[PDB]
C-alpha cells in the first residue's frame, strides 16, 4: 500500500534524536538573521533581509516582523509561509483570550500555546514540522518586558537578549560581550545594528535589508506602544548610530 | 416509600418500608429498600422501583471496581457522588430516585448522604425520603437527641416508620432495620407491621386514634 | 488519520522507538530526587551555554501538578508540557469526582499510563521523558518519591537520578543515603541533593535549582543565594 | 408517524382438512372515494403460500417488492431452490413480521394488517396474522379489519376448534369464506362486490382464483320496507 | 398519531412449591372487544429449566422471550455450556427491560423455576426491569383478581389459627403439585367468570428437576 | 520474494504469498479429520499440548444445534470465524426461522476470508475448518481454506500428516458412506482414519476429541472418559 | 519497512514472535495448582538497591476469587488487568454470580490480536491467571500475546522459565498440599534467580475458595523461605 | 436555593446566602453554603435550579483552580468573572442550560479594592456597589438604596446586612433558615460564624 512511501516525520534515531527537527533546524540557520534585545524601558527586533533585490518593494513589505497584537510581536526565521500560517493561530488565540477574560493575554502563554502547536507536528500526524523559529518580543503586567523564543521542536526559553537564523553563534558572542542589565532602548538599537552588521553575509549594512522594530513604554502615561520601523525611519537611525 | 437514616453517638441508624405500589394498587409488602453496597456502605431506595434498583446495584459495581484499583475501600462522599454524577446526566429525561449513602470510613467516619434524580447531594446527619417522609420526620424530629443508645436510636427509627406506614397509604408492609458501626453495618431483622403495630400500640400505649 | 504503527517490536524482542526515546532522556539535563524523613527535595540541572537568558520567564525545571504535588523531569522539553498538562487536568478532575486531592502514587499510575498508551498506539511516537514525581498524599506526613520512563513502568523510590550523567550521581546516592536513617531535616536533605549534583553539575552558581516539597502543600522554591550557601559549605568541608 | 392514504379492507381466512383458504376484496378506498377497482391484494409467493394484504396500498405495493425480492435471494447459489430449500409460509412470516415490528420500533410504520396462509413442506397448514404494531397470532379463522367482527363469527361455525379442522372439506370451507365476502359486501361501506380467492392445498397446490363476484343476494325484502316508523306508503 | 402500543389482554400466574414451580397462563388473545385467538401460548421453555411469561403487549412479549431465549443460547457459547441459574437469568432479564428504559417493552414478565439448591422459585418484572423471587404472583388483566386470593391460599394472609384469640397466624408451609394446581384452576376459572378478556383455556408449565411437563384446561369461551 | 510484503501484492507468475503463508500455518496445526453418511456426519480431532503439565488444545467448536467445525492452524482466527457462524446461524433462526443451509454457512466464510486478501492493512485468516451439519438436504461436511475456498465432501482431513487419512478416506469412501442409522460404527472410522496421521504417538482418553451430528442427534462433542470407548 | 499483521513464510504472525523474545527478558513468574488452591510466585528483580521493592507490583488482583501474575514489559499489562477486572465485575452485575476463570482469560485473550494497521501492536508481557469457580475448580491459566490460553498443572515464565519448567515438571504431582506448594515455587524462584532470594525481592500469594485471592505480606513470606532453607538442609 | 445577597463596601466584598435546602413540603437541610471558594481571593454564591447549581459552582471552582495550577497566578476577579459569563452565554442556547444565577465577590490585589459581579442564568453581568438574585432584590435594592453609602466599613456593612436579612424574615413568605455570611478583602476568604 502507501506505507511504501512515508518518510516517517515523527520518529525517533538510534541517538534519540528527532531527525526533521533536526534537519528543520539545519534550514533556519540559512535564514536570515534576526535578533531580539530586552531593555528595562522596552524591547528591540532587529532583522536582516534575505538577499534583496533592487526592484523588490520595500515599503510596502513584510517578510521578518509581524504583529500578534497591541503589546506583542515576532521576528521570523525560516519558511515565511509556515510562519503566517503559525502567525494567524497565534492572533485568534489571543483574540479568543481577550474574547474571554476581557484581558489581553500574557505573553508567555501566547507563546505556550504556539510551541504546543509546533511540538504536536513532532509526536504524532505524520507532517513535517514548520520549519520556523519565532523570537517573541511582548509586555504584559505580570511580567512587564519580556523575550522568548520557539523553534520546530516546540520549546521555548526566555532570554534577555537572543539571535535565530544565521549565523546565532557568531551573533551571541557579540550580544555576550557588551550586553548589561540597566541598558536603555536606544543602547539596545544600537546593539542589534552593530551585532547584525559585524554577522551579516553582506558587503555592508543598508536600510533596504532591514526590518526593524520597537516596543517601548515611550506613549503618554503608563501605556506601550509597537513601531514598526518605515524604510526612511531606518535609514535615519543607521547614520545616527554611524553604520553609514 | 418511606426511609429514613440519622446519625447518633452509636454510629448510624437506617430504617425502610417494603411496600411497592403501582398507583393505588398494592404490587408487593416484601420489597428489599435497603441495598447492600459493601460490609461498611448501604443504600436506600425510594421512587422508581426500577430506576433506583438499577443504578444502586450498578453503584456497587463502580465500588468495586475503586477498591480494585485503588487497593482501598470507597469514601461515602465519593461513592454518593458517583451516582449523583450518574443522574445529572440523566437530568430532564425522567429518572425517579429519592436515595440516601449511608456508611462508615476511616477518614470520614459515620456519613449520611442525600442523593436524588435532580441532582441534588446533600450531607447531612437526618434524612427522610418517600411518600410518607413527613410522617417520618414527625416521629423522628421530636423524640430525637444525639445521645441515643443503641436500643432506644433503633426502636426510634422502627417506630417512625410505623408511624407512616400507618398514616401514608402507599407505605407499609414491614420494616427493615440497620445499624452501622465502626466495624460495618448490622442488620437488625424484617418487622411485620401486621404484628408490630398491636405489639408496640399495647406496650407503649399509643396508636389511640385506632380502635383497639 | 495517521495511523502508521511506529513504535513495534525487532526480531530480538525489542521496541526501539522506546529505547531511542530513553536516549533522549540520557541526553537531557540531569534531575535528581532525595527524599528524607519528613520531607522531598528535588534538585535540577541547568546547563551553563546558555548566558543572557532571562530566568524570571523561562519555564522552570520543576512544575506543579497540585498545591501539594510536583513534578521534575528529564528529556525533550516541548513533550514535558504536554504530560504535565494532563496531569495537572486529571488532579482537578480527581478532585470534582471523588472529593479529595490525588495520591502521588496515583498521579503517577495516571502519567505512566498515558506514556504507555504512546508506545502502542498508531501515528504516535514515545515520550523522550522521564519524570520524578514527589510530594504528600492528603492528610499522610510519609515522603513519597515516584519515577515514571517512556515505556510506561513506574516506581517508588527512596532517592533517584535521571539525565544526563545520572549514573554518577546514583552511584553517589547508592552510598551516601542509608535506608534505615534518612536526611532528619530539611537541611540535611537539600544538602545530600546538591551534593549529588555537585558531583555532575560543573559549578554551582545559576546552574542548580532546588525544590523543597513539605507536608500539607508546603511546596517552595529555593533562590541563587540561599543554593549558594549550600555550595560554599560543602566545598570547604570537602578540603580535608 | 404515518396516516394511510389508499387502503384496502379485509382479508379473511381460513384451515381446511388438507389445506387453507385465503380471500381478499380488488378496492383500492380513498377514504370514502372507492377509487381503484382492479387492485390485487392476494400475493402468491412460490406455489406454496399466498400472502394477503389489508391497509395502506403504497406499503402494500413495498411488501410485495420484498417478497419478489425474497425469491430471488433465495435462489442465489441454492441448488435446491425449488425442492427442499424451497420458501417455506413460516420463513415467509416470520420475515414480514420482524420487518413489521421493526419498523413499529422505529416509530414508522407499514400501515397494514398481513395473514399469511400456505402449506408447509411436511403437508401442516400454516396460517398466522401479523399487523403494523408487530403483533402476530394463529388461529383455525383468520380475518383483518371488519372481517375479523362479522366473518370470524361466521366461519367459526364452522372450525371452532383444533380438532374441527380434519372434519371440514375444501367445499365446505370454500363456501364458508364465499358467504363471509358476500355479508362483508352488504356490511362494510369500503369493500367492493368483486374480489379474488385463493386455496393452497397439500395434494392439488395451489389454486388462484380471479374475478369472483358476490352473488345470491337478498334484496327483495327492501320493496317492503316504507318509511322510517309510521309512513305507511 | 401512531401509537406503537396496543393491550393483548390475557393473564399469567406463578406458584412455587418445595421441590417445584408451576407457571400458568391462559391462552386467550384478544384486541379491543374482539378475539385474536382462543389458543395462542405465552408461557414458554427457554431452557435449562426455566420457564417464562411475559404478558401484556404480545409483540413486546414476544420480543422480550425471543431475546431471552437467545441470551440462554450465547449464555452456553461463551461460558462452556454452563447452566443459567433462575437468579442469574433474572438478573440478565433486568438489563434487557431496562435496556428499554425510554422506550419499554409494556409487560408484566414472570419467570420460573429451580434455585441452586433445588427448591422452587418464582421471580417477578416490572415493564422497566424491576425484580423480586417471591412464592407467589400473579400478572396481567386479571393480576388484581386473582393476587389477594393468593396471599390467602398460598401465604395464608389474614388466616389465624382457630381459638387463639387471633394471636397466632396459621403457619406457613410448601404446597403439594397437586394442591397447587387445584388453586390455579380455581384461580383462573374464577377470574374467566369476571374478567372479559380471560378464557378459552388454561395452559400450566410444571418444572420439577426431571423436566418440563405440561397440562391443558378448557376454560369458558364466551 | 519481493511480492510477499502484503496480501493486496500479486507475484509475477500470479500468487499471493501472504495467502500461501497462512496455509502454511494449517499444515504445522494438529490433524483434524471429517467423514459423513448419509444419516450422520462426524468430526474427529487430535488435540495437542504444550507439555505434559499443559492442557490439551480443544479443536472443535459448536456453531448451532445442527452444526459445528473443528480447526487447524491459528486458534483465534477459528474463534473470530466461528462466532461469526454463531451469529449468522442466529440470524437465520431469528428472522426467518428457519436453520442455516451448511453450503450457506460456507458461501459466507468463503466471503468473509476473501474481503481479508484484498484490502491493504488486513491479513489473510491462518486457519482451515472443517464444517459438519445436519441440515434439510441431509448430511454434510466442508472444508474451508483461507484463500477463500469451500470444498464440499464426503470426507477429508487437514492438518499435519493430513495426507494419510485422506488417502485412508479415499480407499474406504464406499464402505462408510453407508453407515446409515449407526453413530458408533461411523466415528470408529473417522478414528481408524485419523490413525493413519499418527507417528510414534498414540490417541489417549485426553488427547483424543470427536464430535458427531446427524438426523435425530444434535450437535455434541465428546471429550475425556466419554471417548475411551473409541480406543 | 513490513506490515505489522505479516505472515512468515513459515506460518507465523512476525510481530506476535517478537513479543515473546521480549517476555524471555521479563523477569520469573511462577503458578501452582493444587486441590488445596493455586499459589503464584514472582520476581521482583529491582533495577537498583534505592528503588522501594514493596512498589514493584507484579502480582494482581482481577476479582475475589480470581488473581494475576505477570511476565515482560510490565506497563503493557495494566490495560489488560484493567479489562480483566471490569469483565469480571461487569458479568457479575450482567448475572449476579462469579466469573468463570476460563471466560475471564477468554476476554483478555480476544484483545491480544486486536492489533495492526486497534492497537498498533502485541502485547509484550505475558499474565498467569489464577483463579477459582464452582465448575472447575483451582485452575491455572497462561495467556499469551498470541490470543492463544493453555491451563496448566503448573506452570513458569520468564527469563528462567525453561529451567523452571523443567523442575516443575518432576516435583508436580496431583496431591500437592497448599503448603508444600508454597515452598516449591520458594525452590524453584531461588535456583533460576540471579540475585539471593528473601522476602524483599520475592513475592508470594495464593488463591483459595474460603479466604479468596490474597498476597502475602513479606513477614509471612520470610517465615516460608525460613521454612525453607531448613528443609533442604535436613537430608 | 433562594436568597443570596452581596454588598461592596471601601475595602471588602460581603456575601450573605440562606440555609435552607427545601423539596416539596420539607425542609431538607438548614445549614447548607451556597458558596464555593473560586480561589484565594475570589468566591462565587450561588442559586437556582436543584442539581444545576453545584454542578455549575465546582466545574467553574475546578477551571479557575486549573488556570491558578498552569501560570502559578492568581486571576482578577474581572477575569473571572467574565469566564463565568461566557460559560453562562454558551449554556443558554445549549441543549439544557444551566439554570443558575451567581454572585462573584473578589479583592483584586493588583487594584486593591473589592469587587461585586450579578450575572444572572442567560450570562446578563453587572458589576455592582450590591447585588441580589430572586425575590430578595425585591426588598434589599430599596433598602440598600437609602442605607448604604460607599465608604462604609465592614463592620458597618454587616450591620446593614443585618437590616436586610432581618426585613426578608420579616416579610419573606417562605422560611430560609438564616444566612451564613463570608467576606472577602485583602486577606482573602473568611466566615462568619455568628450571624
Ligand atoms: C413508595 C411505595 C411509593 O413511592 C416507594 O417510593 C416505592 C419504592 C420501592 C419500590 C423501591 N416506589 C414504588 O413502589 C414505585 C412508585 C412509582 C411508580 C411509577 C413511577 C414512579 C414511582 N412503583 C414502581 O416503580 C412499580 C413497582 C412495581 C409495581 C413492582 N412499577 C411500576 O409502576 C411500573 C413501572 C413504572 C414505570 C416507570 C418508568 C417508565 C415506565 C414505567 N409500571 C407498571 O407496572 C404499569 N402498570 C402496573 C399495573 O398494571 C398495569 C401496568
Ligand atoms: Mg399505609
Not at chain 1, 509581524?66 to 489571543?94: F, S
Amino acid at each position: 500500500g502507501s506505507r511504501r512511501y512515508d518518510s516517517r516525520t515523527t520518529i525517533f534515531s538510534p541517538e534519540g534524536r528527532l531527525y526533521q527537527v533536526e534537519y528543520a533546524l539545519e534550514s533556519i540557520s540559512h535564514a536570515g538573521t534576526a535578533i531580539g534585545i530586552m531593555a528595562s524601558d522596552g524591547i528591540v527586533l532587529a532583522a536582516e533581509r534575505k538577499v534583496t533585490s533592487t526592484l523588490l518593494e520595500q515599503d510596502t513589505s513584510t517578510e521578518k516582523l509581524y504583529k500578534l497584537n497591541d503589546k506583542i510581536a515576532v521576528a521570523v526565521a525560516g519558511l515565511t509561509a509556515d510562519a503566517e500560517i503559525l502567525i494567524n493561530t497565534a492572533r485568534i488565540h489571543a483574540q479568543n483570550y481577550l474574547k474571554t477574560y476581557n484581558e489581553d493575554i500574557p505573553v508567555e502563554i501566547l507563546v505556550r500555546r504556539l510551541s504546543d502547536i509546533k511540538q504536536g507536528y513532532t509526536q504524532h500526524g505524520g507532517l513535517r514540522p514548520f520549519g520556523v523559529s519565532f523570537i517573541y518580543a511582548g509586555y504584559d503586567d505580570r511580567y512587564g518586558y519580556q523575550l522568548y523564543t520557539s523553534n520546530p521542536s516546540g520549546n521555548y526559553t526566555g532570554w534577555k537578549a537572543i539571535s535565530v537564523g544565521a549565523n546565532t553563534s557568531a551573533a551571541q558572542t557579540l550580544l555576550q560581550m557588551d550586553y548589561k542589565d540597566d541598558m536603555k532602548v536606544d543602547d539596545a538599537i544600537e546593539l542589534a545594528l552593530k551585532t547584525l552588521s559585524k554577522t551579516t553575509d553582506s558587503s555592508a549594512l543598508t536600510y533596504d535589508r532591514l526590518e526593524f522594530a520597537t516596543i517601548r513604554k515611550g506613549a503618554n502615561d503608563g501605556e506601550v506602544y509597537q513601531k514598526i520601523f518605515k524604510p526612511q525611519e531606518i535609514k535615519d537611525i543607521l547614520v545616527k548610530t554611524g553604520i553609514t | 416509600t418511606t426511609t429514613l437514616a440519622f446519625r447518633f453517638q452509636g454510629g448510624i441508624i437506617v430504617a425502610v418500608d417494603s411496600r411497592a405500589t403501582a398507583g393505588n394498587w398494592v404490587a408487593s409488602q416484601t420489597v428489599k429498600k435497603v441495598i447492600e453496597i459493601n460490609p461498611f456502605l448501604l443504600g436506600t431506595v425510594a421512587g422508581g422501583a426500577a430506576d433506583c434498583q438499577f443504578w444502586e446495584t450498578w453503584l456497587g459495581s463502580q465500588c468495586r471496581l475503586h477498591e480494585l484499583r485503588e487497593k482501598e475501600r470507597i469514601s461515602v462522599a465519593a461513592a454518593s457522588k458517583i451516582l449523583s454524577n450518574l443522574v445529572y446526566q440523566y437530568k430532564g429525561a425522567g429518572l425517579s430516585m429519592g436515595t440516601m449513602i449511608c456508611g462508615y470510613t476511616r477518614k470520614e467516619g459515620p456519613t449520611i448522604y442525600y442523593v436524588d434524580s435532580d441532582g441534588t447531594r446533600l450531607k447531612g446527619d437526618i434524612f427522610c425520603v418517600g411518600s410518607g417522609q413527613t410522617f417520618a420526620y414527625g416521629v423522628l424530629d421530636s423524640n430525637y437527641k444525639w445521645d441515643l443508645s443503641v436500643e432506644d436510636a433503633l426502636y426510634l427509627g422502627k417506630r417512625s416508620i410505623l408511624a407512616a406506614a400507618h398514616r401514608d397509604a402507599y407505605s407499609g408492609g414491614s420494616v427493615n432495620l440497620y445499624h452501622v458501626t465502626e466495624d460495618g453495618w448490622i442488620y437488625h431483622g424484617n418487622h411485620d407491621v401486621g404484628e408490630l403495630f398491636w405489639k408496640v400500640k399495647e406496650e407503649e400505649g399509643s396508636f389511640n386514634n385506632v380502635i383497639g | 488519520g495517521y495511523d502508521r504503527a511506529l513504535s513495534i517490536f525487532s526480531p530480538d524482542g525489542h521496541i526501539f522507538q522506546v529505547e531511542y526515546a530513553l536516549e533522549a532522556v540520557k541526553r537531557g539535563t540531569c534531575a535528581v530526587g532525595v527524599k528524607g524523613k519528613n520531607c522531598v527535595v528535588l534538585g535540577c540541572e541547568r546547563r551553563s551555554t546558555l548566558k543572557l537568558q532571562d530566568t524570571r520567564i523561562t519555564p522552570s525545571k520543576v512544575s506543579k501538578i497540585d498545591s501539594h504535588v510536583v513534578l521534575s523531569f528529564s528529556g525533550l522539553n516541548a513533550d514535558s508540557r504536554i504530560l504535565i498538562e494532563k496531569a495537572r487536568v486529571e488532579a482537578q478532575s480527581h478532585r470534582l469526582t471523588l472529593e479529595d486531592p490525588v495520591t502521588v502514587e496515583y498521579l503517577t499510575r495516571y502519567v505512566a499510563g498515558v506514556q504507555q498508551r504512546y508506545t502502542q498506539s498508531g501515528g504516535v511516537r514515545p515520550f523522550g521523558v522521564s519524570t520524578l514525581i514527589a510530594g504528600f498524599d492528603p492528610r499522610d506526613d510519609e515522603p513519597k518519591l515516584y519515577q515514571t520512563e517512556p515505556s510506561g513502568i513506574y516506581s517508588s523510590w527512596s532517592a533517584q537520578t535521571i539525565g544526563r550523567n545520572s549514573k554518577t550521581v546514583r552511584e553517589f546516592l547508592e552510598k551516601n543515603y542509608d535506608r534505615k536513617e534518612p536526611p532528619a531535616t530539611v537541611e540535611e536533605c537539600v544538602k545530600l541533593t546538591v551534593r549529588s549534583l555537585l558531583e555532575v553539575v560543573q559549578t554551582g552558581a545559576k546552574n542548580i535549582e532546588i525544590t523543597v516539597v513539605k507536608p500539607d502543600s508546603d511546596i517552595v522554591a529555593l533562590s541563587s543565594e540561599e543554593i549558594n550557601q549550600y555550595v560554599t559549605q560543602i566545598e570547604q568541608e570537602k578540603q580535608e | 408517524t404515518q396516516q394511510p392514504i389508499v387502503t384496502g379492507t379485509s382479508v379473511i381466512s381460513m384451515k381446511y382438512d388438507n389445506g387453507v383458504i385465503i380471500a381478499a376484496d380488488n378496492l383500492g378506498s380513498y377514504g370514502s372515494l372507492l377509487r381503484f377497482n382492479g387492485v390485487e391484494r392476494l400475493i402468491p409467493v412460490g406455489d406454496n403460500t399466498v400472502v394477503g394484504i389489508s391497509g395502506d396500498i403504497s406499503d402494500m405495493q413495498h411488501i410485495e417488492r420484498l417478497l419478489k425480492d425474497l425469491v430471488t435471494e433465495n435462489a442465489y447459489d441454492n441448488p435446491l431452490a425449488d425442492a427442499e430449500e424451497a420458501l417455506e409460509p413460516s420463513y415467509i412470516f416470520e420475515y414480514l413480521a420482524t420487518v413489521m415490528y421493526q419498523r413499529r420500533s422505529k416509530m414508522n410504520p407499514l400501515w397494514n394488517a398481513i395473514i399469511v396462509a400456505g402449506v408447509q413442506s411436511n403437508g401442516d397448514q400454516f396460517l398466522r396474522y401479523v399487523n403494523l404494531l408487530g403483533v402476530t397470532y394463529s388461529s383455525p379463522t383468520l380475518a383483518t379489519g371488519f372481517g375479523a367482527h362479522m366473518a370470524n363469527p361466521l366461519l367459526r361455525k364452522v372450525v371452532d376448534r383444533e380438532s374441527d379442522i380434519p372434519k371440514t372439506t375444501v367445499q365446505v370451507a370454500e363456501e364458508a369464506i364465499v358467504n363471509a365476502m358476500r355479508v362483508l359486501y352488504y356490511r362494510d361501506a369500503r369493500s367492493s362486490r368483486n374480489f379474488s380467492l385463493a386455496i393452497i392445498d397439500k395434494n392439488t397446490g395451489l389454486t388462484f382464483k380471479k374475478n369472483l363476484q358476490v352473488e345470491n343476494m337478498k334484496w327483495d325484502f327492501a320493496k317492503d320496507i316504507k318509511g322510517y316508523g309510521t309512513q305507511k306508503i | 398519531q401512531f401509537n406503537p402500543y396496543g393491550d393483548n389482554g390475557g393473564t399469567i400466574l406463578g406458584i412455587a412449591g418445595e421441590d417445584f414451580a408451576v407457571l400458568a397462563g391462559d391462552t386467550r388473545n384478544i384486541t379491543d372487544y374482539s378475539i385474536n385467538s382462543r389458543y395462542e401460548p405465552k408461557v414458554f421453555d427457554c431452557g435449562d429449566n426455566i420457564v417464562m411469561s411475559a404478558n401484556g403487549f404480545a409483540a413486546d412479549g414476544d420480543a422480550l422471550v425471543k431475546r431471552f431465549k437467545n441470551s440462554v443460547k450465547w449464555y452456553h457459547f461463551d461460558h462452556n455450556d454452563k447452566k443459567l441459574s433462575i437468579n442469574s437469568a433474572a438478573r440478565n432479564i433486568q438489563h434487557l427491560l431496562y435496556g428499554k428504559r425510554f422506550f419499554p417493552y409494556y409487560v408484566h414478565t414472570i419467570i420460573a423455576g429451580l434455585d441452586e439448591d433445588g427448591k422452587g422459585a418464582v421471580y417477578s418484572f416490572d415493564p422497566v426491569g424491576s425484580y423480586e423471587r417471591e412464592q407467589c404472583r400473579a400478572g396481567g388483566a386479571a393480576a388484581s383478581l386473582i393476587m389477594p386470593f393468593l396471599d390467602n391460599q398460598v401465604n395464608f394472609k389474614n388466616q389465624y389459627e382457630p381459638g387463639t384469640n387471633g394471636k397466632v397466624k396459621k403457619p406457613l408451609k410448601y404446597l403439594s403439585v397437586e394442591e397447587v394446581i387445584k388453586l390455579v384452576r380455581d384461580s383462573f376459572t374464577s377470574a374467566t367468570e369476571r374478567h372479559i378478556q380471560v378464557g378459552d383455556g388454561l395452559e400450566i408449565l410444571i418444572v420439577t428437576k426431571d423436566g418440563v411437563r405440561k397440562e391443558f384446561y378448557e376454560l369458558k369461551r364466551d | 520474494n519481493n511480492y510477499d510484503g502484503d496480501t493486496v501484492t500479486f507475484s509475477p507468475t500470479g500468487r499471493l504469498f501472504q495467502v500461501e503463508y497462512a496455509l502454511e500455518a494449517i499444515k504445522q496445526g494438529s490433524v483434524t479429520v471429517g467423514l459423513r453418511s448419509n444419516t450422520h456426519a462426524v468430526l474427529v480431532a487430535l488435540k495437542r499440548n504444550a507439555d505434559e503439565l499443559s492442557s490439551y488444545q480443544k479443536k472443535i467448536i459448536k456453531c448451532d444445534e445442527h452444526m459445528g467445525l473443528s480447526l487447524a492452524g491459528l486458534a483465534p482466527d477459528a474463534r473470530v470465524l466461528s462466532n461469526y457462524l454463531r451469529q449468522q446461524c442466529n440470524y437465520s433462526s431469528l428472522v426467518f426461522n428457519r436453520k442455516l443451509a451448511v453450503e450457506r454457512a460456507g458461501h459466507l466464510l468463503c466471503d468473509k476470508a476473501q474481503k481479508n486478501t484484498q484490502s491493504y492493512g488486513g491479513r489473510p485468516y491462518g486457519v482451515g475448518l472443517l464444517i459438519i451439519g445436519y441440515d434439510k438436504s441431509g448430511a454434510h461436511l466442508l472444508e474451508f481454506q483461507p484463500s477463500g475456498n469451500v470444498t464440499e465432501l464426503y470426507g477429508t482431513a487437514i492438518g499435519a500428516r493430513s495426507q494419510g487419512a485422506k488417502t485412508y478416506l479415499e480407499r474406504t469412501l464406499d464402505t462408510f458412506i453407508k453407515i446409515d442409522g449407526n453413530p458408533d460404527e461411523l466415528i470408529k472410522a473417522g478414528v481408524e482414519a485419523i490413525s493413519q496421521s499418527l507417528r510414534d504417538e498414540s490417541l489417549t482418553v485426553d488427547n483424543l476429541s470427536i464430535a458427531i451430528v446427524g438426523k435425530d442427534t444434535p450437535f455434541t462433542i465428546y471429550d475425556g472418559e466419554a471417548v475411551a470407548k473409541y480406543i | 519497512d513490513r506490515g505489522v499483521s505479516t505472515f512468515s513464510p513459515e506460518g507465523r504472525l512476525f510481530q506476535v514472535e517478537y513479543s515473546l523474545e521480549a517476555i524471555k527478558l521479563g523477569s520469573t513468574a511462577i503458578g501452582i495448582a493444587t486441590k488445596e488452591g493455586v499459589v503464584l510466585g514472582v520476581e521482583k528483580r529491582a533495577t537498583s538497591p534505592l528503588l522501594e521493592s514493596d512498589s514493584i507490583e507484579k502480582i494482581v488482583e482481577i476479582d475475589r476469587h480470581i488473581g494475576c501474575a505477570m511476565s515482560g514489559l510490565t506497563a503493557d499489562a495494566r490495560s489488560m488487568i484493567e479489562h480483566a477486572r471490569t469483565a469480571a465485575v461487569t458479568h457479575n452485575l450482567y448475572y449476579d454470580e462469579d466469573i468463570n476463570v476460563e471466560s475471564l482469560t477468554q476476554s483478555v485473550c480476544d484483545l491480544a490480536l486486536r492489533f495492526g494497521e486497534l492497537m498498533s501492536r502485541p502485547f509484550g508481557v505475558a499474565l498467569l491467571i489464577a483463579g477459582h469457580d464452582a465448575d472447575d475448580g483451582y485452575q491455572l491459566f497462561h495467556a499469551e500475546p498470541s490470543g492463544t490460553f493453555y491451563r496448566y498443572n503448573a506452570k513458569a515464565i520468564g527469563s528462567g522459565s525453561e529451567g523452571a519448567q523443567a523442575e516443575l515438571l518432576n516435583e508436580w504431582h496431583s496431591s500437592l498440599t497448599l503448603k508444600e506448594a508454597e515452598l516449591l515455587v520458594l525452590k524453584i524462584l531461588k535456583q533460576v534467580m540471579e540475585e539471593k532470594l528473601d522476602e524483599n525481592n520475592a513475592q508470594l500469594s495464593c488463591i483459595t475458595k474460603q479466604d479468596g485471592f490474597k498476597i502475602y505480606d513479606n513477614e509471612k513470606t520470610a517465615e516460608l523461605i525460613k521454612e525453607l532453607k531448613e528443609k533442604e538442609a535436613a537430608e | 436555593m433562594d436568597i443570596i445577597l452581596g454588598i461592596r463596601v471601601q475595602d471588602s466584598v460581603i456575601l450573605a446566602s440562606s440555609k435552607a435546602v427545601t423539596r416539596g413540603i420539607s425542609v431538607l437541610k438548614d445549614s447548607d453554603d451556597k458558596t464555593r471558594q473560586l480561589s484565594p481571593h475570589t468566591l462565587m454564591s450561588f442559586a437556582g435550579e436543584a442539581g444545576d447549581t453545584v454542578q455549575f459552582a465546582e466545574y467553574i471552582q475546578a477551571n479557575i483552580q486549573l488556570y491558578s495550577i498552569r501560570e502559578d497566578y492568581e486571576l482578577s476577579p474581572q477575569a473571572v468573572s467574565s469566564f463565568v459569563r461566557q460559560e453562562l452565554a454558551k449554556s443558554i442556547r445549549s441543549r439544557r442550560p444551566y439554570q443558575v444565577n451567581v454572585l462573584i465577590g473578589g479583592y483584586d490585589k493588583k487594584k486593591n479594592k473589592p469587587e461585586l459581579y450579578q450575572i444572572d442564568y442567560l450570562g446578563t453581568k453587572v458589576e455592582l456597589p450590591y447585588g441580589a438574585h430572586g425575590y430578595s432584590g425585591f426588598y434589599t435594592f430599596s433598602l440598600l438604596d437609602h442605607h448604604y453609602r460607599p465608604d462604609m466599613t465592614t463592620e458597618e456593612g454587616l450591620d446593614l446586612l443585618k437590616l436586610c436579612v432581618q426585613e426578608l424574615e420579616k416579610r419573606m413568605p417562605m422560611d430560609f433558615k438564616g444566612v451564613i455570611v463570608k467576606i472577602v478583602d485583602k486577606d482573602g476568604i473568611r466566615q462568619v460564624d455568628d450571624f
